[PDB]
Ligand binder design. Structure first.
Ligand SMILES: *[C@@H]1O[C@H](CO)[C@@H](O[C@@H]2O[C@H](CO)[C@@H](O[C@@H]3O[C@H](CO)[C@@H](O)[C@H](O[C@H]4O[C@H](CO)[C@@H](O)[C@H](O)[C@@H]4O)[C@@H]3O)[C@H](O)[C@H]2NC(C)=O)[C@H](O)[C@H]1NC(C)=O
Ligand SMILES: *[C@@H]1O[C@H](CO)[C@@H](O[C@@H]2O[C@H](CO)[C@@H](O)[C@H](O)[C@H]2NC(C)=O)[C@H](O)[C@H]1NC(C)=O
Ligand SMILES: *[C@@H]1O[C@H](CO)[C@@H](O)[C@H](O)[C@H]1NC(C)=O
Ligand SMILES: *[C@@H]1O[C@H](CO)[C@@H](O)[C@H](O)[C@H]1NC(C)=O
Ligand SMILES: *[C@@H]1O[C@H](CO)[C@@H](O)[C@H](O)[C@H]1NC(C)=O
Ligand SMILES: *[C@@H]1O[C@H](CO)[C@@H](O)[C@H](O)[C@H]1NC(C)=O
Ligand SMILES: *[C@@H]1O[C@H](CO)[C@@H](O)[C@H](O)[C@H]1NC(C)=O
Ligand SMILES: *[C@@H]1O[C@H](CO)[C@@H](O)[C@H](O)[C@H]1NC(C)=O
Ligand SMILES: *[C@@H]1O[C@H](CO)[C@@H](O)[C@H](O)[C@H]1NC(C)=O
Ligand SMILES: *[C@@H]1O[C@H](CO)[C@@H](O)[C@H](O)[C@H]1NC(C)=O
Ligand SMILES: *[C@@H]1O[C@H](CO)[C@@H](O)[C@H](O)[C@H]1NC(C)=O
Ligand SMILES: *[C@@H]1O[C@H](CO)[C@@H](O)[C@H](O)[C@H]1NC(C)=O
Ligand SMILES: *[C@@H]1O[C@H](CO)[C@@H](O)[C@H](O)[C@H]1NC(C)=O
Ligand SMILES: *[C@@H]1O[C@H](CO)[C@@H](O)[C@H](O)[C@H]1NC(C)=O
Ligand SMILES: *[C@@H]1O[C@H](CO)[C@@H](O)[C@H](O)[C@H]1NC(C)=O
Ligand SMILES: *[C@@H]1O[C@H](CO)[C@@H](O)[C@H](O)[C@H]1NC(C)=O
Ligand SMILES: *[C@@H]1O[C@H](CO)[C@@H](O)[C@H](O)[C@H]1NC(C)=O
Ligand SMILES: *[C@@H]1O[C@H](CO)[C@@H](O)[C@H](O)[C@H]1NC(C)=O
Ligand SMILES: *[C@@H]1O[C@H](CO)[C@@H](O)[C@H](O)[C@H]1NC(C)=O
Ligand SMILES: *[C@@H]1O[C@H](CO)[C@@H](O)[C@H](O)[C@H]1NC(C)=O
Ligand SMILES: *[C@@H]1O[C@H](CO)[C@@H](O)[C@H](O)[C@H]1NC(C)=O
Ligand SMILES: *[C@@H]1O[C@H](CO)[C@@H](O)[C@H](O)[C@H]1NC(C)=O
Ligand SMILES: *[C@@H]1O[C@H](CO)[C@@H](O)[C@H](O)[C@H]1NC(C)=O
Ligand SMILES: *[C@@H]1O[C@H](CO)[C@@H](O)[C@H](O)[C@H]1NC(C)=O
Ligand SMILES: *[C@@H]1O[C@H](CO)[C@@H](O)[C@H](O)[C@H]1NC(C)=O
Ligand SMILES: *[C@@H]1O[C@H](CO)[C@@H](O)[C@H](O)[C@H]1NC(C)=O
Ligand SMILES: *[C@@H]1O[C@H](CO)[C@@H](O)[C@H](O)[C@H]1NC(C)=O
Ligand SMILES: *[C@@H]1O[C@H](CO)[C@@H](O)[C@H](O)[C@H]1NC(C)=O
Lengths: 123, 120, 436, 120, 120, 48, 48
């Protein structure tokens, strides 16, 4: 019953920017941590970013730490990821996922649970 | 200068005498009641400092931005050209707003600290 | 996997006994002994909190009792000590030709009273009630107190009208309110709310019938420590008031004489007009409906097809055999045997004769007597009857008026409130580990 | 919700209202004695928090592991399906053991800190 | 050993029993006055610890060097061969000097911390 | 050796007619006066 | 033997014994006590 649907733009030129978003339904959005994972067309999966259930703590891979911003709105059940610079190495299908973190008073996750449809971003 | 000696000095001068006055906050049924009340006031101020995340500190920095409407003065005209009595009068209408924001800020930070300590 | 995490400010509490303070807003009870009240007090409903209450073990009643007695005694300290009045009195009957129920009551007594100078004496004539004067053998009489206690004359400028007193908890404690509508004084309350102070409770002093105060909201509530133990009192809280109209019809003329250097004694000088008996009126229809409701509720504890009989009180002092109350400063002792006589088997007023006494031995004590000065003119008061104190005496149960223990007049308002101590510190497992 | 408003809420909901109740712990010889006793109780709780290494904190994490025998429940049935009153009753027999362990843990850590500050 | 049990032990042995005695500092008008005074003394000592930068600590290290004239003994003859009563007597003439230096040291450090937090 | 600390740039508004130190001084003096007459002789035999 | 000075004869000497010495005291008279009322709620006791 959990539905995660990614939206956003497709092809941009080097040096541009894109804001991707994820609409969530079928579960309490504010009860789970959320993350973004990407897969280059010819590669495996790579974790990109993680945001906790309250939106206060964000983590990134070093390769995007100074370029990507992750945010969430728990009243709109919406995530967004704003990417700047947009390098050639960032071409990938980006997936919205539920899991990857917990909040001390909940049991541990340390895994990705629900995955979205995915959206392809090219440069 | 001694207790309250800096009262007529500028805010940036009087900020260096905080220990002089802090040490003078603690130093016949009506007189005993007065002593108990003085203790209660001391503890209430210490409780407010603790809630805001300022324990053994006389000067502590926070994460609440100044909203300008509280006072739109330059730093050069507050710390160098104003006393603490004038400042206290100037923002007396906002002290119950700022304190509330301070409590909320600590509540968020304290929870964030707990979450950062649950990552293996 | 889990580590101990310490939390401070935890919403838990434990039963506790502490000292409460009063708030209120001359009089025998006063506001200078209390703090100002909060014009906008708060009440916080606890949506999922169910607490166990026991009105019979509620320590707020003992404190209220002690505080009321202390205020009463403090209010009699700056007043006149009537030691010059323990003298031989020479009395005759004031109106010996009456055929009413006051024949033999109100004696015209003469005595040699002291005055400002120690060398002189003043002959004084005054009227005393029969109940205040004991025959020793015009005939020789003494005041009833000379046998056991001294009398302090209450200050005539200090009112005896009850002033609502709000009891407030000290910081670190909270008062929980039941807020249930069918709560019988014991057991759980599933609708507990938190308050800082209680409502204003009037320190009304009475026996048998509880005058003024709060009413039940849905039905008459029968409250007892045991029900089956006939040695306990039953407190009946009514859901409708019954109005009682009490009067002291005699137009008393009050005189004042100086008995010492800065002290004066007040006494009834004469009575203008006819001599009439003090009495109270309760209507028959309202009282009969009230008893019908009380019987209906009593049949839920003693079963149906059980005959419920009401009867007058039996022995003891007037404080417990009659309905004692303060009406406009006078102390009435109403018979009530017209109110409690009936057997219940599965505008037409009732007039209750009332006696008046001037020498009061209040709070079931010996050695501290009070003299109530007479009040000029005719006294009338209208009160609400809000509850009853009954005692239980086969197929028929007999109930009689009881009372005299003032704590049962207060453990009737302070029954929905409990005092608890806040325990803000606690621990719980989490996955949070100290960095170290 | 206000003072004790969260009393009927779950532990993980009531944990966000700690400042509301902390601020209500401080806010006629018998009444003066009651005020002095309330102050003494406040200070004793603050002393216990200080001994455990928790000064200006409402939520503080420690190094004492949960021993399971104290309570073998899942986190999902404590923070989400239990109140603080029920928890307090459940472990009322162990509060004098846990506190002792907490004091010992701080004593070791404090000494360790001193030793780490003596390395040139 | 219990309260004051380490009084006859060496300084380096008695330093491990600080919680035992700290917990015993808090645990009829004249008796009420005595209780209020005991509270005032407790708070004054806590205020001194706070001013020096030592809040929730029983052992805290500072930046004031030992000046030798206060006591020119070896560490091996203070912590291993002396009691706290003997030490207290030995330096009773210098306790009002050291404390003053401690207050000044914290005042400088606290201001330095503020300046380090104003660098973008 | 009591101290007095001059406030070089402090100007304050005073009002001797609303100064609550007077009411306390009055109450304290009356209380001391009455306390000093408690362990003394009551001349009630002289109202002759 | 405990004393503030020993040599100062103006001081008391407190002697603490290491064994008790028993002392048996009696009031052999079989007194009959009477009571009379002397005021409103007061009574005086005396040997009758
Ligand atoms: C239950 O509550 C009712 C209602 O409050 C109460 O009846 C009321 O009692 C008061 C006090 O006796 C009455 O107020 C008096 O009214 C008369 C009217 O003539 C006044 O003269 C009185 O003033 C004189 O007495 C004062 C001292 O009490 C003096 O201070 C004053 O200067 C005057 O000398 C006083 O205002 C009030 O009228 C009645 N209410 C009604 C509707 O009659 C009843 O007594 C309560 N029950 C019990 C058991 O107390
Ligand atoms: C209250 O009034 C009742 C009467 O209504 C009193 O009871 C009566 O007492 C007399 C003796 O004085 C008996 O002869 C009557 O037979 C009694 N009547 C009833 C119905 O019992 C009662 O004693 C009065 N109580 C007080 C305290 O005065
Ligand atoms: C008072 O103001 C003058 C300037 O007018 C200044 O030089 C002096 O230092 C001030 N005094 C104090 C104690 O701040
Ligand atoms: C500043 O204060 C005004 C008035 O209270 C408020 O409307 C505004 O939102 C505040 N600024 C911020 C950033 O919240
Ligand atoms: C405050 O700073 C601004 C620069 O942003 C300057 O133009 C203005 O004159 C300053 N005012 C004062 C009082 O220093
Ligand atoms: C605070 O508000 C009042 C109006 O309610 C205003 O008169 C007063 O000047 C304000 N205070 C300040 C310091 O501006
Ligand atoms: C008052 O005293 C006189 C003697 O002076 C005595 O004859 C008289 O009977 C006394 N009257 C009363 C009522 O005691
Ligand atoms: C005097 O008091 C006693 C009890 O103290 C009582 O039994 C006795 O009846 C009293 N005397 C009179 C005449 O009432
Ligand atoms: C009051 O109700 C409780 C049930 O909650 C019952 O156990 C108790 O016996 C009742 N007491 C009376 C006097 O009705
Ligand atoms: C009083 O109540 C108890 C229960 O609390 C009951 O066992 C006892 O029988 C009652 N008393 C009488 C006389 O029945
Ligand atoms: C009492 O009796 C005397 C005569 O013995 C009379 O003069 C006096 O007026 C009477 N008192 C009253 C109130 O009538
Ligand atoms: C009491 O008096 C009022 C008038 O003030 C009257 O309306 C009412 O019916 C009376 N009640 C009784 C029980 O006599
Ligand atoms: C009055 O009470 C009696 C019970 O003794 C009852 O039989 C009668 O019906 C009642 N009358 C009214 C009008 O309530
Ligand atoms: C009569 O008593 C029985 C219990 O024996 C009860 O079940 C029934 O409801 C009662 N009836 C009424 C009308 O109170
Ligand atoms: C009134 O009480 C008597 C007993 O004192 C009783 O015999 C009589 O029946 C009662 N009256 C009524 C109407 O029940
Ligand atoms: C009592 O009688 C006097 C006669 O002088 C009269 O003036 C007064 O009004 C009467 N009192 C009452 C309450 O009627
Ligand atoms: C009697 O109760 C009613 C409400 O039921 C109230 O309005 C009225 O004032 C009360 N009477 C008295 C004298 O308190
Ligand atoms: C009370 O419990 C209900 C669930 O039964 C919950 O929805 C509600 O939020 C709770 N109230 C509080 C104040 O926690
Ligand atoms: C847990 O508690 C039990 C009983 O007190 C004890 O025997 C056991 O050693 C404890 N666990 C640890 C790890 O100390
Ligand atoms: C607790 O967690 C275990 C997994 O280790 C699971 O099997 C069990 O059902 C859980 N219990 C509850 C009440 O969640
Ligand atoms: C605490 O121990 C007692 C036995 O001494 C036991 O009856 C009680 O249930 C225990 N408490 C808990 C919460 O298990
Ligand atoms: C007392 O001194 C002896 C050495 O003389 C030492 O062994 C012993 O441990 C000391 N006792 C304490 C309590 O320090
Ligand atoms: C040590 O103390 C002496 C005497 O007070 C003083 O002269 C000396 O300067 C102090 N040492 C330092 C480093 O300040
Ligand atoms: C103190 O240390 C010195 C080495 O600098 C040594 O010569 C001296 O004997 C030591 N004194 C003691 C008492 O250990
Ligand atoms: C402190 O100084 C006095 C002289 O003022 C001296 O007699 C005393 O011995 C000194 N104390 C110590 C511990 O040396
Ligand atoms: C007590 O003993 C001390 C020796 O410790 C001695 O100096 C003193 O004089 C003695 N006093 C008496 C009264 O024996
Ligand atoms: C009292 O004691 C002192 C020593 O403390 C001694 O010098 C003096 O002589 C004694 N008094 C007499 C009278 O000997
Ligand atoms: C005292 O003397 C009288 C005679 O003067 C005598 O009657 C009385 O009994 C004596 N008292 C005693 C206690 O013997």
């Amino acid at each position: 019953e959990v539905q995660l649907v990614e939206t956003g733009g497709g092809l941009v030129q080097p040096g541009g920017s894109l804001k991707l978003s994820c609409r969530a339904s079928g579960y309490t959005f504010s009860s789970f941590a959320m993350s973004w994972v990407r897969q280059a067309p010819g590669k495996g999966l790579e974790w990109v970013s993680l945001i906790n259930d309250r939106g206060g703590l964000t983590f990134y891979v070093d390769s995007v730490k100074g370029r990507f911003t992750i945010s969430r709105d728990n009243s709109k059940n919406t995530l967004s990821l704003q990417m700047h610079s947009l390098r050639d190495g960032d071409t990938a299908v980006y997936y919205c996922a539920t899991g990857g973190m917990s909040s001390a008073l909940q049991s541990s996750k340390y895994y990705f649970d629900f995955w979205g449809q995915g959206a392809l971003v090219t440069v | 200068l001694g207790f309250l000696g800096a009262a007529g000095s500028t805010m940036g001068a009087a900020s260096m005498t905080l220990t002089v006055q802090a040490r003078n906050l603690l130093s016949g049924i009506k007189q005993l009641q007065a002593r108990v009340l003085a203790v209660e006031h001391y503890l209430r101020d210490q409780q407010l400092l603790g809630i805001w995340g300022c324990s053994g500190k006389l000067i502590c920095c926070t994460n609440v931005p100044w909203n300008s409407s509280w006072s739109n003065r330059n730093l050069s005209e507050i710390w160098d050209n104003m006393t603490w009595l004038q400042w206290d009068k100037e923002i007396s209408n906002y002290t119950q707003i700022i304190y509330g924001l301070l409590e909320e800020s600590q509540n968020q930070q304290e929870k964030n600290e707990q979450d950062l300590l649950a990552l293996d | 996997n889990l580590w101990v995490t310490v939390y401070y400010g935890v919403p838990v509490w434990k039963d506790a006994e502490t000292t409460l303070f009063c708030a209120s807003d001359h009089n025998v009870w006063a506001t200078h002994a209390c703090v100002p009240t909060d014009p906008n007090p708060q009440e916080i409903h606890l949506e999922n909190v169910t607490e166990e209450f026991n009105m019979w073990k509620n320590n707020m009643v003992e404190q209220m009792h002690e505080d009321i007695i202390s205020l009463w005694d403090q209010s009699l300290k700056p007043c006149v000590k009537l030691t010059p009045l323990c003298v031989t009195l020479q009395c005759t009957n004031y109106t010996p030709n009456l055929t009413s129920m006051m024949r033999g009551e109100l004696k015209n007594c003469s005595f040699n009273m002291t005055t400002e100078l120690r060398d002189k004496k003043q002959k004084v004539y005054s009227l005393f009630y029969r109940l205040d004067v004991v025959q020793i053998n015009n005939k020789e009489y003494r005041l009833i107190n000379c046998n056991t206690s001294a009398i302090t004359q209450a200050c005539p400028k200090v009112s005896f009208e009850p002033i609502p007193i709000h009891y407030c908890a000290p910081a670190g404690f909270a008062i929980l309110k039941c807020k249930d509508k069918k709560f019988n004084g014991t057991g759980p309350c599933p609708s507990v709310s938190t308050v800082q102070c209680t409502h204003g409770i009037k320190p009304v002093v009475s026996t048998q019938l509880l005058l003024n105060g709060s009413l039940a909201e849905e039905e008459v509530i029968i409250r007892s420590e045991n029900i089956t133990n006939n040695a306990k009192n039953i407190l009946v809280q009514l859901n409708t008031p019954v109005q009682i109209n009490c009067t002291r019809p005699n137009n008393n003329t009050v005189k004042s004489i100086r008995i010492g250097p800065g002290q004066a004694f007040y006494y009834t000088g004469d009575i203008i007009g006819d001599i009439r008996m003090a009495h109270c009126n309760v209507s028959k229809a309202t009282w009969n409906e009230t008893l019908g409701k009380v019987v209906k509720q009593l049949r839920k504890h003693f079963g149906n097809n059980t005959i419920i009989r009401f009867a007058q009180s039996s022995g003891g002092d007037l404080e417990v055999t009659t309905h004692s109350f303060n009406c406009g400063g006078e102390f009435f002792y109403c018979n009530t045997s017209g109110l409690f006589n009936s057997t219940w088997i599965s505008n037409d007023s009732i007039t209750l004769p009332c006696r008046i006494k001037q020498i009061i031995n209040m709070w079931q004590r010996i050695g501290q007597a009070m003299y109530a000065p007479p009040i000029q003119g005719v006294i009338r008061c209208v009160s609400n009857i809000t509850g009853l104190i009954l005692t239980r005496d086969s197929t028929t149960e007999t109930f009689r008026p009881g009372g005299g223990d003032m704590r049962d007049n207060w453990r009737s308002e302070l029954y929905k409130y409990k005092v608890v101590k806040i325990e803000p510190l606690g621990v719980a497992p989490t996955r949070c580990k100290r960095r170290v």
